[PDB]
Amino acid sequence: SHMCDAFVGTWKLVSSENFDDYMKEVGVGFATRKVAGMAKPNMIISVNGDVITIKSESTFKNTEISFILGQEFDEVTADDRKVKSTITLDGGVLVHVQKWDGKSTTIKRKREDDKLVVECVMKGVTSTRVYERA
């Protein structure tokens, strides 16, 4: 077992706050914001040895990233940014930093009660997305 096993499973989005403003701050275009904001994704998290895989499945896009903690990788985001990503564990929280074009955003994933809580931060703007077990 690892502690990261707490994240493993299939999760469904049940609430989203301030996601449009987060996307605006990130630089997402109008039409993409509207369609992505409407999405109600499932997040599927799995672990196999040192490799963590996070999938997002929705009517908008199906994305998948696989990574090793602390080890940088190239990611193409759902809004088609090409970013350099590093994901680490900090006191039980998965911290995902994306860097592109001199900009940076941080996505934190944490377990709270029976929920998985995702905090998306771009400068001073924070969006909170809450998922429950599917």
Ligand SMILES: CC(C)c1cc(C(C)C)c(S(=O)(=O)O)c(C(C)C)c1
């Ligand atoms: C449009 C961009 C900024 C975006 C889209 C999505 C989905 C709606 C595909 C997500 S997430 O996969 O729901 O966490 C996320 C997370 C990783 C913040 C970001």
